[PDB]
Amino acid sequence: STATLCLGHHAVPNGTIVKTITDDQIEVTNATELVQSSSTGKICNNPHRILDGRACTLIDALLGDPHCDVFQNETWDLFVERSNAFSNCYPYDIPDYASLRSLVASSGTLEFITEGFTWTGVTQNGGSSACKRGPANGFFSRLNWLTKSESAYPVLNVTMPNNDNFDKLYIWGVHHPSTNQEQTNLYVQASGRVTVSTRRSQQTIIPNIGSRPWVRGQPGRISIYWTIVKPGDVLVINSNGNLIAPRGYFKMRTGKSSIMRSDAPIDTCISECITPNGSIPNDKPFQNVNKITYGACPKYVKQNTLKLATGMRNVPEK
Amino acid sequence: STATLCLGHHAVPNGTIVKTITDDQIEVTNATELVQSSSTGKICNNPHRILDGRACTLIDALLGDPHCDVFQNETWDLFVERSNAFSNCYPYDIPDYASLRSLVASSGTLEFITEGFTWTGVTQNGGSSACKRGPANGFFSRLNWLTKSESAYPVLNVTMPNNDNFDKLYIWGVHHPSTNQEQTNLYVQASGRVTVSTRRSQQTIIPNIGSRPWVRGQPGRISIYWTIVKPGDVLVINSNGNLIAPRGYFKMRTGKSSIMRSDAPIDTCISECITPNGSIPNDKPFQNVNKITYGACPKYVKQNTLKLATGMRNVPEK
Amino acid sequence: STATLCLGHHAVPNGTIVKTITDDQIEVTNATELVQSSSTGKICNNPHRILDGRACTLIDALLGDPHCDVFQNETWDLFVERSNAFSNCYPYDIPDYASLRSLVASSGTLEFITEGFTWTGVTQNGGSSACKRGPANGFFSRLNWLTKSESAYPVLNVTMPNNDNFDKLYIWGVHHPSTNQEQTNLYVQASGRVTVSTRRSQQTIIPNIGSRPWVRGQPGRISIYWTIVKPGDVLVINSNGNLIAPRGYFKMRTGKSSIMRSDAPIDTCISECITPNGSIPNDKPFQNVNKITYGACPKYVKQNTLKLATGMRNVPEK
Amino acid sequence: GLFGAIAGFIENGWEGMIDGWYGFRHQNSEGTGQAADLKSTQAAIDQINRKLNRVIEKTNEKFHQIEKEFSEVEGRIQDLEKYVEDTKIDLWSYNAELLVALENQHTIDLADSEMNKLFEKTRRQLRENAEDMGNGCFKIYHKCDNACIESIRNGTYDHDIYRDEALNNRFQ
Amino acid sequence: GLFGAIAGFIENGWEGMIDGWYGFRHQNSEGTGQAADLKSTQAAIDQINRKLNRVIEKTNEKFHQIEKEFSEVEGRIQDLEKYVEDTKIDLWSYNAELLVALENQHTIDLADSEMNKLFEKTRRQLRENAEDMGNGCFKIYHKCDNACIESIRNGTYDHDIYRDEALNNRFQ
Amino acid sequence: GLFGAIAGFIENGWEGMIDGWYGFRHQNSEGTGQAADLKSTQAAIDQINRKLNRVIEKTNEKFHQIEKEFSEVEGRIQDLEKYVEDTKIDLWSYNAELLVALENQHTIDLADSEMNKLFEKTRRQLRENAEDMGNGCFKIYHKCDNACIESIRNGTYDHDIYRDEALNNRFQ
Ligand SMILES: CC(=O)N[C@@H]1[C@@H](O)[C@H](O)[C@@H](CO)O[C@@H]1O
Ligand SMILES: CC(=O)N[C@@H]1[C@@H](O)[C@H](O)[C@@H](CO)O[C@@H]1O
Ligand SMILES: CC(=O)N[C@@H]1[C@@H](O)[C@H](O)[C@@H](CO)O[C@@H]1O
Ligand SMILES: CC(=O)N[C@@H]1[C@@H](O)[C@H](O)[C@@H](CO)O[C@@H]1O
Ligand SMILES: CC(=O)N[C@@H]1[C@@H](O)[C@H](O)[C@@H](CO)O[C@@H]1O
Ligand SMILES: CC(=O)N[C@@H]1[C@@H](O)[C@H](O)[C@@H](CO)O[C@@H]1O
Ligand SMILES: CC(=O)N[C@@H]1[C@@H](O)[C@H](O)[C@@H](CO)O[C@@H]1O
Ligand SMILES: CC(=O)N[C@@H]1[C@@H](O)[C@H](O)[C@@H](CO)O[C@@H]1O
Ligand SMILES: CC(=O)N[C@@H]1[C@@H](O)[C@H](O)[C@@H](CO)O[C@@H]1O
Ligand SMILES: CC(=O)N[C@@H]1[C@@H](O)[C@H](O)[C@@H](CO)O[C@@H]1O
Ligand SMILES: CC(=O)N[C@@H]1[C@@H](O)[C@H](O)[C@@H](CO)O[C@@H]1O
Ligand SMILES: CC(=O)N[C@@H]1[C@@H](O)[C@H](O)[C@@H](CO)O[C@@H]1O
Ligand SMILES: CC(=O)N[C@@H]1[C@@H](O)[C@H](O)[C@@H](CO)O[C@H]1O
Ligand SMILES: CC(=O)N[C@@H]1[C@@H](O)[C@H](O)[C@@H](CO)O[C@H]1O
Ligand SMILES: CC(=O)N[C@@H]1[C@@H](O)[C@H](O)[C@@H](CO)O[C@H]1O
Ligand SMILES: CC(=O)N[C@@H]1[C@@H](O)[C@H](O)[C@@H](CO)O[C@H]1O
Ligand SMILES: CC(=O)N[C@@H]1[C@@H](O)[C@H](O)[C@@H](CO)O[C@H]1O
Ligand SMILES: CC(=O)N[C@@H]1[C@@H](O)[C@H](O)[C@@H](CO)O[C@H]1O
Ligand SMILES: CC(=O)N[C@@H]1[C@@H](O)[C@H](O)[C@@H](CO)O[C@H]1O
Ligand SMILES: OC[C@H]1O[C@@H](O)[C@@H](O)[C@@H](O)[C@@H]1O
Ligand SMILES: OC[C@H]1O[C@@H](O)[C@@H](O)[C@@H](O)[C@@H]1O
Ligand SMILES: OC[C@H]1O[C@H](O)[C@@H](O)[C@@H](O)[C@@H]1O
């Protein structure tokens, strides 16, 4: 007459190992993976405007090194430097290289407006062998090498107002001759001087002669500096020698633009998140590809795998 | 014959919504708030000693710009720099201005102690039409503009020992003429040199001549530096031109003094936690007014609202 | 007739108070500490190769201060500087001292490889009474003080290629005369210069004459600089005065080496964790010893104690 | 709630209950009545207040720190300063989000438990004199006037005095 | 598990139940059957789904940041850039580990809890007509055919109708 | 405790028990006894032990880092070196504090659960032979000597053997 009713849960053959507070190893019936641990080997050309630096460094593209003149006025949500880019122009040094690269990469543009700088008493557009724009001599497309004119180097002094409503990025630099004969010979004065100032800032440099390892045959070097001039402020360049004058300025903007060191080929797809290792899907809280990422991404975690249990404990039958 | 006892629980008319490990929305009978989101708008005047920089920046008060004389030796828990401060003295420039603003700010005092330096062979207390102190030409109160005397400028060399038990912060500087003529005229030597040292350190700065943009009519510029002398050490200033000598020192102290940039009015009340948007209540764990804080403040977080269920789950009633 | 069965749990005489989510104080039958708060007061001699600087600063050692030659080429897992160490060689000053000390400490070795000098035209091995080496006037072991020779200081210019397979760490310096008479008298030129470059960098330093407070009787000083030459690159030293030349180079390796300032005595035991307080046990998850730590250790935390309950709730009995 | 009392085997709530979080509602020869259980209610409030306090009375001070807004573009150093403060914020915004999540989930289960605890306490008191009707109500198989109900609510109910009258009803 | 039903007083699960997480198996006069409880299985699912969603639907965008790999030795400033990124990584890894540990424990306990509600839901229906055999089975002390078993499964069963029969078989 | 057993319906613990966590205490014809339940005790201990190991055997290595003490004022750069370190410690000190809190709060409930699993395990065994007195004690309605009791404790108790004898005492 009795009847028998038994309640029961389900169960499965292959369960999932999960950790819990009271168990670094237990077996449930189901879970998902939270640690995105794979890549696709490539960078999606979208949605982020990508720019392959190819053989050029953001810097060189900025200065105007011949083989990068293709990059002029480029924009980029993400500039991508490659391990094989090279510089093919006059030997240069940039104290605080890091910071220039960073503030340019972040502005994410290279619009360059040329201004009418007047250099009276000096010769312009000088060139060098180490910087062959074509088979003939040249220089950085954005810089003006200035040399003596009719046996003399004036106390250069030019003003250039910033009457616009945005900031201007002027980058210039000074020349460090290999020997005294080369100094006197190029600028006449046995000792040069460059002063670039505004109402807010002032940086003055003093060339320094000496011989340095040959690079594209040049023992001497050009040190590179930058100056930002705010709206309403004015730029004043004062120099009686060794000045590598400005030709204009770079428009500065504020955005989500940046740069990344990578060799991943750039393909055509959609990936909000980008890593040096290429694109990776943003559906998992965590990821184990590269601490280095760009865009909507999953926090990087030492752990290469974490399983979120999503089903009851799995208690099999025998 | 029989009775009926029924256990139950309360239920309110309008519960509050809260998130749980399995609900970003469920309804309880009550919740408190863990995120302070509003500010009185003003900075309460006293659990902390607040000093209003009015028209002066901590630096200009430190150097002694004429209209910042009211701040001579002021002390503070939190210095408030107003966005509309301005400089009305000689054109200057401080390399690493930020670090100097920071160490003075943390010192929390402008106690200036005048010592008896010995400037033999030069004229003292030079002044400028750019730092008018009254109808006349003044200069920074804590600085001494030395120029040539009776057709000469000695190889100035002075010594000031630290026979105290506390540290002395010396603030001196050097002058950058606008032309060679100004150089030889004020200092005679066609090239200046300033070397301020201790047994612990040295910093020798060389003036750089050239035209900078007119600021209150002045083309030149004064470059400012600083030196910390420890008890048992002595200061030694050696310069044969262009030295903007010290008049003593500022006693350095350690505390919880700091500085903040805000335009909020200061009022009379009692508030431990100050922010650029005004004081706020530290009775909550998280705040959303601003990441900038002074005092016993609530940890800042992005979300603007987080409800802590302080009541059971509300289940309507029919 | 009948019987009575009761179920229960234990309790103890003296339990342990514990904090939960609904009590900052609640007794449990037992717990275990998670905050290592005590130290032996001595640093175990290993498994970490420890090196006691004794009275030498990792910099003084590197430079070769007489009483620190004992460390010539030592190696270390953890260099330990003492509060009583001192310097007794010529007065020096290193711009970005912190940085040098750092990069060396992490290299964990003083491997010095003397190289071929080429100082043709100058008097070598300059020495000072402020740096006695026995009865004689010595100087840092790794540095070569160059002066004039037969009334004249050549326009020194040497080259040193990096043909090995590891980065070389050269450290040189430039001397600052106390007076002009000293300048001319030592380097003949009235204005010295030192430039040490590579195909990758270039740093040119200019001497600065002036009087500084005596140090072991000397008013002059040596500013010290370093350069890292990369494999395939080459070093070049161009100077016509005031150069304190390099004798060779240090081999730079990468590992787990580092430095710590402690007066803790180095005893003979085995401890994985080292702190300025001596070694400590790493069996717990957190420590309140020191935030400064070397090796495998627990995370510093502000709390001096956190009891992790390991038993149920202790309930007395009236 | 892991115990399934509130918003479970117990259909609704009582907006009628003003003096407590949990209570009794009977119906006997004398009519109906209602009353909150002070020992139960206080039990959960005390627990929730403690929990709340663990989270409110605590804040630490910080005075001099690092700048957080800048006027000019600097570069490397300024990048780091902003990354650090941002990192701090993201982490802290995280704990804040989890805390409440955890706290609230536990808070509703706690409230559910304490309801269930009150039922068991009551079922155990009536012993063989009533039966669980499954909806949070007990059917007391014996006359139980206002007094008798009261004795149950203040836990002085003597199951013996009625076991026979009830045993009859229940098993007849 | 906190309610000790799953992997508890219910020796083990059924691999043959492919239509839900919870359900019934019976053996009455007309043979043996097996139905699943949708109400139950669903409730657990919905709960574990929402828990999941909270955890996966969230990511933060981070464009220009600080560098993290270096081609040359620098010292002070670089050591700092590293410590910052290394400290950051370690904090999240801790957040990530603790997250799943906590989430999982609560997942497993939530399933156990559900299982048990269905058992206690069932128990209260059967009243004085059945007994808890201890293996998760209810021994219905009266004749309960497939029409009867079903009435129980989605709570339409009426204890009164079979009480007298049951009591008779129980207390004999 | 969410399960209201320990510090709940079970008045208090037993200082007299020194060989285990949970156990029984009887008072049969032959006097009174006491014996700790190994199975249940071990379950508790094992779980909280793992819990423990998950927290103790883990610490990572860090060597060359950043200076954390300074002998002279520097400014911007240093301010950052402190602020970074300070923010790290505050975050960690927070993780620790919340970890014990959660953990403990759980260890306390886990134990209160395990107890309740034992109470329930027994109740079930005794079927209709006993009655929950409400204090964690069952009143067995039939002569139960030491051999009888023993059987319960190691779960081989044959509820039938005494059902009649028991049913009669219960309902008379
Ligand atoms: C697709 C899905 O979400 N199911 C998961 C599977 O992905 C996972 O690999 C396994 C163990 O981790 O558990 C479940 O079967
Ligand atoms: C190199 C080149 O094509 N010049 C253009 C310039 O004519 C134009 O005015 C500017 C506007 O931003 O963009 C580019 O710089
Ligand atoms: C590494 C380096 O700069 N070497 C150059 C060499 O190339 C050149 O031929 C010579 C000029 O006479 O000067 C140096 O030796
Ligand atoms: C995720 C992956 O494929 N691993 C590599 C790692 O080995 C390498 O060191 C790094 C360099 O950028 O890139 C990736 O992180
Ligand atoms: C704990 C809290 O702040 N919440 C409030 C409490 O202050 C107040 O006493 C209660 C009135 O019943 O409503 C809420 O629970
Ligand atoms: C910005 C600037 O310095 N311009 C000044 C101008 O103000 C001044 O009237 C003139 C003096 O002769 O020199 C420069 O032109
Ligand atoms: C191991 C190594 O780097 N070689 C040098 C060795 O040439 C030299 O004689 C000694 C100096 O005292 O230091 C190191 O041993
Ligand atoms: C050569 C000379 O006259 N210089 C002195 C020098 O002796 C001394 O070290 C210093 C401190 O008194 O003052 C001057 O520099
Ligand atoms: C655990 C202990 O003894 N604390 C000391 C602290 O008092 C001392 O000032 C510090 C020095 O750096 O070392 C340790 O932290
Ligand atoms: C502590 C308490 O309230 N006890 C009362 C008791 O005084 C009263 O006689 C009985 C009948 O109403 O109810 C409760 O048992
Ligand atoms: C009492 C004692 O010697 N402890 C000191 C403490 O005073 C100081 O604030 C700290 C500095 O970080 O070092 C030690 O902990
Ligand atoms: C293995 C075990 O403990 N079983 C014993 C059984 O041997 C014994 O006959 C009975 C009487 O005390 O008690 C338990 O059932
Ligand atoms: C001596 C001299 O010529 N200086 C001028 C000066 O008037 C002006 O401040 C500046 C800006 O135009 O230009 C300089 O050349
Ligand atoms: C005590 C001190 O050092 N403070 C000086 C004080 O000596 C001087 O008499 C006073 C005059 O205003 O100005 C303060 O700056
Ligand atoms: C005295 C000493 O220890 N130093 C010698 C040194 O004489 C020799 O020229 C050098 C070359 O590497 O190697 C060391 O053995
Ligand atoms: C012109 C001169 O004499 N200086 C040479 C220079 O050409 C070369 O860069 C260097 C490298 O060996 O050697 C210098 O002595
Ligand atoms: C401040 C200092 O160092 N003074 C010394 C002093 O010992 C000595 O009396 C004097 C004689 O020239 O030389 C100075 O350099
Ligand atoms: C003295 C005591 O009873 N405390 C014990 C301790 O011996 C054991 O090693 C530790 C590990 O969890 O936990 C407690 O149970
Ligand atoms: C409400 C409901 O649908 N439950 C069904 C009922 O309608 C049906 O009459 C009976 C016969 O199978 O079985 C129950 O389970
Ligand atoms: O490449 C090495 C370099 O050696 C030099 O001596 C000259 O011959 C240069 O023209 C040549 O480029
Ligand atoms: O204020 C600007 C300044 O600029 C010049 O043109 C001078 O003539 C001054 O007279 C005049 O005031
Ligand atoms: O420290 C005192 C010091 O003062 C001067 O430099 C000279 O008089 C030295 O001979 C003497 O040793």
Curated annotation (Swiss-Prot), chains D, E, F:
Gene name per UniProt: HA
Glycan attachment sites: N154
Cysteines paired by S-S bonds: C144-C148
Originating organism: Influenza A virus (strain A/Duck/Ukraine/1/1963 H3N8)
Protein name: Hemagglutinin HA2 chain
